[PDB]
Tab-separated table of C-alpha atoms (C1' of nucleotides) in Angstrom:
chain	number	residue	atom	x	y	z
A	1	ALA	CA	24.993	18.485	-24.620
A	2	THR	CA	26.340	15.007	-23.623
A	3	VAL	CA	28.789	15.953	-20.842
A	4	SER	CA	31.972	14.305	-20.064
A	5	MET	CA	33.908	15.725	-16.868
A	6	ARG	CA	33.213	19.400	-15.351
A	7	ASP	CA	29.833	19.923	-14.060
A	8	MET	CA	30.289	16.556	-13.411
A	9	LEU	CA	32.762	16.658	-10.738
A	10	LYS	CA	30.742	20.072	-9.781
A	11	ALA	CA	27.464	19.371	-8.814
A	12	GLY	CA	27.859	16.080	-6.694
A	13	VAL	CA	26.743	13.278	-9.207
A	14	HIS	CA	29.723	11.098	-7.916
A	15	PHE	CA	28.282	10.478	-4.632
A	16	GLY	CA	26.168	7.310	-3.392
A	17	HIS	CA	25.306	5.921	-0.609
A	18	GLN	CA	26.862	4.918	2.774
A	19	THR	CA	28.781	1.664	3.399
A	20	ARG	CA	25.921	0.635	5.531
A	21	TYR	CA	23.888	0.519	3.107
A	22	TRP	CA	25.634	0.384	0.124
A	23	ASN	CA	24.492	-2.635	-2.573
A	24	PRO	CA	26.052	-6.054	-3.091
A	25	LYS	CA	25.711	-5.813	-6.933
A	26	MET	CA	27.391	-2.105	-7.300
A	27	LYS	CA	30.748	-3.559	-7.115
A	28	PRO	CA	32.259	-2.422	-9.975
A	29	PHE	CA	31.096	1.261	-10.358
A	30	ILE	CA	32.876	1.424	-6.680
A	31	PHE	CA	35.902	3.833	-6.272
A	32	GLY	CA	36.138	5.813	-3.490
A	33	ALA	CA	35.190	5.893	0.589
A	34	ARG	CA	34.871	9.632	2.249
A	35	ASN	CA	33.899	8.868	5.285
A	36	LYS	CA	31.856	6.038	4.731
A	37	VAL	CA	30.027	6.812	2.261
A	38	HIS	CA	30.507	5.165	-1.995
A	39	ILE	CA	31.747	7.038	-4.257
A	40	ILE	CA	30.872	6.109	-8.602
A	41	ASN	CA	33.997	5.178	-10.173
A	42	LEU	CA	33.693	7.500	-13.486
A	43	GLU	CA	35.190	6.081	-15.786
A	44	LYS	CA	32.424	3.627	-16.810
A	45	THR	CA	29.653	6.251	-16.514
A	46	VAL	CA	30.378	8.527	-19.501
A	47	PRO	CA	30.840	5.466	-22.130
A	48	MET	CA	28.075	3.881	-20.548
A	49	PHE	CA	26.253	7.402	-20.361
A	50	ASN	CA	26.957	7.988	-24.033
A	51	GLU	CA	26.513	4.058	-25.318
A	52	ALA	CA	22.486	4.501	-23.500
A	53	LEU	CA	22.502	8.347	-25.266
A	54	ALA	CA	23.272	6.789	-28.553
A	55	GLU	CA	20.848	4.055	-28.673
A	56	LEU	CA	18.261	6.812	-26.685
A	57	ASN	CA	18.571	8.252	-29.428
A	58	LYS	CA	18.524	5.402	-31.825
A	59	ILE	CA	14.721	4.555	-30.773
A	60	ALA	CA	13.991	7.996	-30.720
A	61	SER	CA	15.328	8.977	-34.344
A	62	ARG	CA	12.624	6.458	-35.052
A	63	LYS	CA	9.716	8.526	-33.634
A	64	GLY	CA	9.551	6.123	-30.550
A	65	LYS	CA	7.333	7.632	-27.541
A	66	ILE	CA	9.900	8.509	-24.425
A	67	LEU	CA	8.406	8.333	-21.269
A	68	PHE	CA	10.194	9.358	-18.083
A	69	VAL	CA	9.915	8.518	-14.795
A	70	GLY	CA	10.554	11.340	-12.292
A	71	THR	CA	8.274	9.762	-9.571
A	72	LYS	CA	10.134	11.027	-6.016
A	73	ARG	CA	9.543	14.469	-4.240
A	74	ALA	CA	13.326	15.885	-5.357
A	75	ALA	CA	12.580	15.845	-9.161
A	76	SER	CA	9.002	15.628	-9.244
A	77	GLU	CA	8.561	18.770	-11.441
A	78	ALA	CA	12.874	18.894	-12.402
A	79	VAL	CA	11.562	15.894	-14.447
A	80	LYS	CA	8.122	17.397	-16.239
A	81	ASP	CA	10.406	20.911	-17.461
A	82	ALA	CA	12.554	18.479	-19.009
A	83	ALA	CA	9.503	16.560	-20.613
A	84	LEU	CA	7.109	18.982	-22.167
A	85	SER	CA	9.917	20.974	-23.765
A	86	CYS	CA	11.269	17.654	-26.002
A	87	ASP	CA	7.311	16.724	-26.054
A	88	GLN	CA	7.617	13.438	-24.205
A	89	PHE	CA	5.721	12.259	-21.433
A	90	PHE	CA	6.365	11.665	-17.664
A	91	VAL	CA	5.296	10.072	-14.870
A	92	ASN	CA	6.430	12.632	-12.204
A	93	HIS	CA	3.723	11.514	-9.311
A	94	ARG	CA	3.248	8.449	-7.449
A	95	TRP	CA	3.463	5.057	-10.424
A	96	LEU	CA	-0.476	3.597	-10.647
A	97	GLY	CA	0.842	-0.745	-9.789
A	98	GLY	CA	-0.418	-1.595	-12.638
A	99	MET	CA	-0.109	0.225	-15.702
A	100	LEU	CA	1.475	-1.073	-18.724
A	101	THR	CA	1.133	-4.323	-18.416
A	102	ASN	CA	-2.704	-3.628	-16.845
A	103	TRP	CA	-2.802	-1.320	-19.708
A	104	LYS	CA	-6.217	-3.058	-20.867
A	105	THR	CA	-7.711	-0.811	-17.772
A	106	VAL	CA	-6.128	2.347	-17.120
A	107	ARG	CA	-7.070	3.543	-21.068
A	108	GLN	CA	-10.539	3.539	-20.262
A	109	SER	CA	-9.766	5.793	-17.143
A	110	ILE	CA	-7.683	8.278	-19.317
A	111	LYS	CA	-10.475	8.559	-21.339
A	112	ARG	CA	-12.288	9.685	-18.786
A	113	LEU	CA	-9.514	12.764	-18.412
A	114	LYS	CA	-9.736	13.636	-22.028
A	115	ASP	CA	-13.734	13.572	-21.152
A	116	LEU	CA	-13.733	15.626	-17.845
A	117	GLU	CA	-11.044	18.151	-19.071
A	118	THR	CA	-13.208	19.301	-21.675
A	119	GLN	CA	-16.335	20.534	-19.724
A	120	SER	CA	-13.683	22.475	-18.049
A	121	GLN	CA	-12.166	23.462	-21.211
A	122	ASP	CA	-14.857	25.432	-22.175
A	123	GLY	CA	-16.326	25.986	-18.788
A	124	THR	CA	-19.992	23.433	-19.110
A	125	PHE	CA	-19.019	22.436	-15.249
A	126	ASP	CA	-21.408	25.050	-13.791
A	127	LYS	CA	-24.602	23.391	-15.260
A	128	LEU	CA	-25.698	21.660	-12.111
A	129	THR	CA	-25.314	22.991	-8.488
A	130	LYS	CA	-21.978	24.487	-7.500
A	131	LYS	CA	-20.496	21.372	-4.521
A	132	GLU	CA	-21.397	19.260	-7.397
A	133	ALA	CA	-18.874	20.905	-9.861
A	134	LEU	CA	-16.751	21.126	-7.115
A	135	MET	CA	-16.647	17.429	-6.736
A	136	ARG	CA	-16.087	16.841	-10.273
A	137	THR	CA	-12.921	19.654	-9.996
A	138	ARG	CA	-10.957	16.969	-7.044
A	139	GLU	CA	-11.670	14.221	-9.562
A	140	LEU	CA	-10.394	15.810	-12.649
A	141	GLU	CA	-7.212	17.615	-11.014
A	142	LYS	CA	-6.479	14.378	-8.638
A	143	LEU	CA	-6.362	12.706	-12.233
A	144	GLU	CA	-4.005	15.053	-14.096
A	145	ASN	CA	-2.058	15.277	-11.693
A	146	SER	CA	-1.458	11.615	-10.938
A	147	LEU	CA	-1.586	10.707	-15.052
A	148	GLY	CA	-0.728	14.137	-16.872
A	149	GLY	CA	1.382	14.470	-19.477
A	150	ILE	CA	0.714	10.218	-20.448
A	151	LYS	CA	-3.074	11.441	-21.467
A	152	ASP	CA	-1.290	11.647	-25.329
A	153	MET	CA	0.444	7.904	-24.912
A	154	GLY	CA	-1.715	5.587	-27.354
A	155	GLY	CA	-0.615	2.746	-26.157
A	156	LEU	CA	3.144	0.744	-24.727
A	157	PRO	CA	6.464	3.726	-25.207
A	158	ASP	CA	9.579	2.112	-26.074
A	159	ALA	CA	12.400	4.612	-24.107
A	160	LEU	CA	11.907	4.369	-19.942
A	161	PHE	CA	13.678	6.626	-18.093
A	162	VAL	CA	13.782	5.991	-15.084
A	163	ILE	CA	15.433	7.893	-11.875
A	164	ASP	CA	16.311	6.141	-8.351
A	165	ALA	CA	15.667	2.250	-9.865
A	166	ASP	CA	14.788	1.181	-5.962
A	167	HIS	CA	12.485	3.149	-5.814
A	168	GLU	CA	11.187	2.729	-8.456
A	169	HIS	CA	11.839	-0.754	-9.166
A	170	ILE	CA	7.848	-0.743	-9.503
A	171	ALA	CA	8.230	0.753	-13.152
A	172	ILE	CA	11.268	-1.016	-13.996
A	173	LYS	CA	9.049	-4.619	-13.143
A	174	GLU	CA	6.633	-3.554	-15.555
A	175	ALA	CA	8.988	-2.324	-18.333
A	176	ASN	CA	10.845	-5.736	-17.654
A	177	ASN	CA	7.915	-7.966	-19.248
A	178	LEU	CA	6.798	-6.004	-22.136
A	179	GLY	CA	10.536	-6.490	-23.602
A	180	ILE	CA	10.857	-2.501	-23.255
A	181	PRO	CA	13.819	-1.345	-23.080
A	182	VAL	CA	14.367	0.816	-20.141
A	183	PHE	CA	16.925	3.197	-18.854
A	184	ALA	CA	18.417	3.975	-15.266
A	185	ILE	CA	19.847	6.203	-13.044
A	186	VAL	CA	21.429	2.878	-10.439
A	187	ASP	CA	22.507	4.523	-7.193
A	188	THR	CA	24.655	2.554	-4.854
A	189	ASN	CA	21.960	1.920	-2.962
A	190	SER	CA	19.723	0.621	-6.057
A	191	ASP	CA	20.097	-2.847	-8.200
A	192	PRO	CA	21.517	-2.594	-11.662
A	193	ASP	CA	19.177	-5.961	-12.856
A	194	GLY	CA	15.958	-5.384	-14.303
A	195	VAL	CA	17.794	-2.594	-16.434
A	196	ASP	CA	19.588	-3.281	-19.453
A	197	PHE	CA	21.486	0.011	-20.116
A	198	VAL	CA	21.875	1.050	-16.451
A	199	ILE	CA	23.999	4.091	-15.244
A	200	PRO	CA	25.674	4.371	-12.248
A	201	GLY	CA	26.367	7.692	-10.048
A	202	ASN	CA	24.076	9.883	-7.448
A	203	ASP	CA	20.207	10.588	-8.690
A	204	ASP	CA	19.806	12.287	-4.788
A	205	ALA	CA	20.940	15.457	-5.785
A	206	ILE	CA	18.730	18.340	-7.491
A	207	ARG	CA	21.388	19.590	-9.806
A	208	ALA	CA	22.534	16.363	-10.468
A	209	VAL	CA	19.428	15.741	-11.924
A	210	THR	CA	19.503	18.653	-14.507
A	211	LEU	CA	22.495	17.011	-15.523
A	212	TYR	CA	20.674	13.564	-16.711
A	213	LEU	CA	17.550	14.300	-17.669
A	214	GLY	CA	19.480	17.927	-19.289
A	215	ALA	CA	21.227	15.332	-22.005
A	216	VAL	CA	19.037	13.040	-22.529
A	217	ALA	CA	16.298	15.996	-23.625
A	218	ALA	CA	18.274	16.849	-26.147
A	219	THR	CA	19.046	13.423	-27.679
A	220	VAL	CA	15.328	13.202	-27.945
A	221	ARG	CA	15.292	17.235	-29.647
A	222	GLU	CA	17.795	16.373	-32.360
A	223	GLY	CA	16.232	12.901	-32.850
A	224	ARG	CA	13.059	14.111	-33.935
A	225	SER	CA	15.238	15.653	-37.702
B	1	A	C1'	-38.257	-33.921	-5.396
B	2	U	C1'	-39.904	-28.137	-6.164
B	3	G	C1'	-41.701	-22.286	-8.914
B	4	G	C1'	-44.038	-18.394	-5.988
B	5	C	C1'	-43.605	-16.297	-1.291
B	6	U	C1'	-42.815	-15.195	3.697
B	7	G	C1'	-39.504	-14.477	8.498
B	8	U	C1'	-34.325	-14.941	10.708
B	9	C	C1'	-29.396	-13.198	10.861
B	10	G	C1'	-29.820	-7.014	10.238
B	11	U	C1'	-31.603	-1.776	7.840
B	12	C	C1'	-26.177	-4.863	10.880
B	13	A	C1'	-22.682	-2.599	6.573
B	14	G	C1'	-20.424	-5.589	4.641
B	15	C	C1'	-19.983	-8.428	-0.403
B	16	U	C1'	-17.495	-9.701	-5.055
B	17	C	C1'	-15.915	-9.264	-10.158
B	18	G	C1'	-12.738	-8.048	-14.717
B	19	U	C1'	-7.447	-6.605	-15.219
B	20	G	C1'	-2.737	-6.960	-13.316
B	21	U	C1'	0.782	-7.945	-9.737
B	22	U	C1'	2.313	-12.086	-6.155
B	23	G	C1'	2.907	-17.689	-4.702
B	24	U	C1'	3.979	-24.463	-7.528
B	25	G	C1'	-0.580	-24.107	-4.910
B	26	A	C1'	-5.472	-23.519	-1.671
B	27	A	C1'	-5.481	-18.179	-2.448
B	28	A	C1'	-4.321	-12.798	-1.521
B	29	U	C1'	-3.387	-8.609	-3.003
B	30	G	C1'	-7.588	-5.427	-4.421
B	31	U	C1'	-11.368	-4.872	0.543
B	32	U	C1'	-4.850	-3.331	4.640
B	33	G	C1'	-2.622	0.738	6.873
B	34	G	C1'	-3.635	6.845	9.304
B	35	G	C1'	-7.660	9.499	10.261
B	36	U	C1'	-13.461	10.435	9.921
B	37	U	C1'	-18.049	8.371	9.449
B	38	A	C1'	-24.557	6.321	11.622
B	39	A	C1'	-21.767	4.259	6.653
B	40	G	C1'	-14.985	-0.252	2.665
B	41	U	C1'	-18.667	7.308	5.148
B	42	C	C1'	-14.970	10.435	2.703
B	43	C	C1'	-9.544	11.945	2.130
B	44	C	C1'	-4.388	10.988	2.333
B	45	G	C1'	-1.200	7.096	1.443
B	46	C	C1'	-0.541	2.002	-1.244
B	47	A	C1'	0.809	-3.331	-6.438
B	48	A	C1'	-2.894	-1.844	-7.371
B	49	C	C1'	-6.544	0.521	-11.574
B	50	G	C1'	-11.420	0.201	-12.410
B	51	A	C1'	-16.397	-1.759	-11.692
B	52	G	C1'	-21.332	-4.138	-9.327
B	53	C	C1'	-24.708	-5.818	-5.402
B	54	G	C1'	-25.043	-2.220	-1.641
B	55	C	C1'	-25.065	2.922	2.822
B	56	A	C1'	-26.512	7.924	1.231
B	57	A	C1'	-29.577	10.246	-2.566
B	58	C	C1'	-34.197	9.867	-5.418
B	59	C	C1'	-39.555	8.152	-2.721
B	60	C	C1'	-44.516	8.738	0.610
B	61	U	C1'	-45.564	12.089	5.271
B	62	U	C1'	-44.505	15.862	9.445
B	63	A	C1'	-42.587	20.631	10.097
B	64	U	C1'	-42.634	27.280	7.932
B	65	C	C1'	-43.796	30.084	3.541
B	66	C	C1'	-45.176	31.448	-1.255
B	67	U	C1'	-48.771	31.112	-6.184
B	68	U	C1'	-53.421	28.725	-8.061
B	69	U	C1'	-58.902	27.957	-6.130
B	70	G	C1'	-62.865	29.077	-3.039
B	71	U	C1'	-67.962	24.016	-2.799
B	72	U	C1'	-71.325	21.369	1.013
B	73	G	C1'	-65.624	24.381	2.953
B	74	C	C1'	-63.884	29.629	5.472
B	75	C	C1'	-65.857	34.574	9.301
B	76	A	C1'	-61.429	38.325	9.726
B	77	G	C1'	-63.467	43.302	7.579
B	78	C	C1'	-69.117	45.772	6.298
B	79	G	C1'	-74.859	44.608	6.866
B	80	G	C1'	-78.819	42.377	9.189
B	81	U	C1'	-78.377	38.923	13.996
RNA sequence: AUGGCUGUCGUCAGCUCGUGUUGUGAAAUGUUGGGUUAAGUCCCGCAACGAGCGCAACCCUUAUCCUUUGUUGCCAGCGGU
């Protein structure tokens, strides 16, 4: 469902940030000054969206491992339901500084995650005492809280969808070095560099993120067939 | 000129590494910060993610109960004193 303007101009995706907070590189994607707040010009959003949608489909058509990034609070579970529905990965909690570039080490910690889920899959934590077992639920729970829906990755992904390029620039900086293409919903408060397939507009509204993630969930599910 | 061995800082809680990242570089980050602890003890957060020597625990003794055994050990309950 590649939206054009209908529910786009109804959820508040045009919006942006204060003229006190705007980043100078967002000059071309601007139209509006409603009460000293920058409004994105949608005329170069939907075409840019569809071109990105096309390339995201190309990756998914060749069985590309798509990895989302919706780390912030008001996107947490939103990205999660919009990820496991399209059988792809996601980064909903704090990004582990040095995840992809430091894959050599995190791979071993994620190996531990599969192992720990094993004793809790059939129930063999009760072999030892309760408090000691309570300890392994603390680690395991925190382990699946951070590296949950990424445990079945197998290596480096190909499609990195990220929300709020300025707040999650760490993921972008790691995806720049590996030549891995990254797709971001760049806010007027963010920076378009680092990301090749930039998409201007808002990323703060809860309704708005469902518009983006909803549309991309479709592109992958059609590229699988 | 040394090995082995010991003292001291001090039984003070600190000392480092692999990988990644930042800086031309020495190095830094991790090991900073908010709390907390006898203790980088623990939690949360964090360009850091894990790991090692350390603190703890495991060790011996002491403090209560229990089982087994009853001599040269023991004396309640019964005889003889």
